[PDB]
Amino acid sequence: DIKPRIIRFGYGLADDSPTGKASAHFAEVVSKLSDGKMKVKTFGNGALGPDEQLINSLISGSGEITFVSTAPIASLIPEFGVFDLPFLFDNEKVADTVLDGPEGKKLLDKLPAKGLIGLNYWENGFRNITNSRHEISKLDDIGGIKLRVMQNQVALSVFKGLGANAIPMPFTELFTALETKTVDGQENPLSTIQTSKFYEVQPYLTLSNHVYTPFVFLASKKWFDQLSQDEKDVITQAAADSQAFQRKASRQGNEDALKYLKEHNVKVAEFSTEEREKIREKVAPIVESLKAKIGKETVEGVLDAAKKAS
Numbered sequence: 001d002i003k004p005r006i007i008r009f010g011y012g013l014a015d016d017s018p019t020g021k022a023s024a025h026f027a028e029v030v031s032k033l034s035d036g037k038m039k040v041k042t043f044g045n046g047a048l049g050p051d052e053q054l055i056n057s058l059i060s061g062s063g064e065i066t067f068v069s070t071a072p073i074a075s076l077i078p079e080f081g082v083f084d085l086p087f088l089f090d091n092e093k094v095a096d097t098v099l100d101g102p103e104g105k106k107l108l109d110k111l112p113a114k115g116l117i118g119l120n121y122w123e124n125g126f127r128n129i130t131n132s133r134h135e136i137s138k139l140d141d142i143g144g145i146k147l148r149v150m151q152n153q154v155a156l157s158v159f160k161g162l163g164a165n166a167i168p169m170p171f172t173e174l175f176t177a178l179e180t181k182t183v184d185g186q187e188n189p190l191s192t193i194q195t196s197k198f199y200e201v202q203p204y205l206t207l208s209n210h211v212y213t214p215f216v217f218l219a220s221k222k223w224f225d226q227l228s229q230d231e232k233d234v235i236t237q238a239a240a241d242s243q244a245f246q247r248k249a250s251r252q253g254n255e256d257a258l259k260y261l262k263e264h265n266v267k268v269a270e271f272s273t274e275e276r277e278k279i280r281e282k283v284a285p286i287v288e289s290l291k292a293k294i295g296k297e298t299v300e301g302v303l304d305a306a307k308k309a310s
């Protein structure tokens with residue numbers, strides 16, 4: 001029971017980012033599983049707007065499928081803000097375990113009340129600081145930097161607490177803000193820095209890996225609910241296949257991006273062991289400060305699940 005259907009899948013990252021390629025993979029699997037009857041059309045590079053607009057399009061029904069970072073979802077469901085706390089996940093194995101386990105599912109289960117289906121989590125990844133003002137290799141080097149952040153109170157409060165002038169902006173405005181130096185820098189995974197070309201306007205890169213961002217792979221509930229069960233199964237089966245593809249592509253992409261940026265002579269710094277402890281000390285009270293704006297039980301449950309996975 002599958003009828004011909006065209007499905008629009010907009011997203012913010014470049015079409016040749018790992019997640020852009022995973023979106024094309026999803027399209028291919030949907031076509032395969034539906035004998036070519038269900039056709040997914042991908043619109044990358046922010047062609048259908050940034051995350052905030054994509055979310056709204058799924059709620060309204062103008063769009064069917066997207067992936068977005070968890071951070072803009074915090075404007076609908078504050079508990080999703082948990083992932084903007086620094087150093088939550090020691091590595092990607094911990095992340096997968098927590099996200100695919102009960103603590104991840106509790107959050108996904110809050111989406112339908114807002115008109116969204118969280119099909120599963122994809123990997124945005126560990127975020128790294130870039131800027132055009134000066135090298136950042138110490139906590140103090142962040143003071144007064146105008147740093148674009150994602151658009152929720154947790155991200156703004158974290159970087160303000162680290163001394164930055166935190167400037168929330170949609171991802172789709174970011175390259176130009178960097179190029180014109182309306183902001184000094186930003187922070188994102190290496191493959192995004194590469195495929196969105198931020199290195200062309202960001203001479204400095206710090207391998208801070210300070211935050212891990214999940215993507216949520218999303219379907220419009222209004223749209224999903226009017227699918228037949230056979231068609232829903234195509235979507236959920238393709239989503240499971242594509243998650244595995246995505247995560248592998250993301251992790252290979254992270255390795256490839258580091259190699260590329262280094263070989264391109266981007267200037268790369270890190271936080272020494274001492275500076276790392278300074279950052280940990282400064283973060284701990286702002287993390288505690290933000291539990292009330294995320295949800296105490298969410299923060300503590302994610303932290304406990306991460307400990308058990310680590």
Ligand SMILES: O=C(O)[C@H](O)[C@@H](O)[C@H](O)CO
Nearest residue numbers: 012013051068069150171
């Ligand atoms: O910096 C950001 O906003 C995120 O990292 C991106 O992936 C964003 O979701 C994209 O569309």
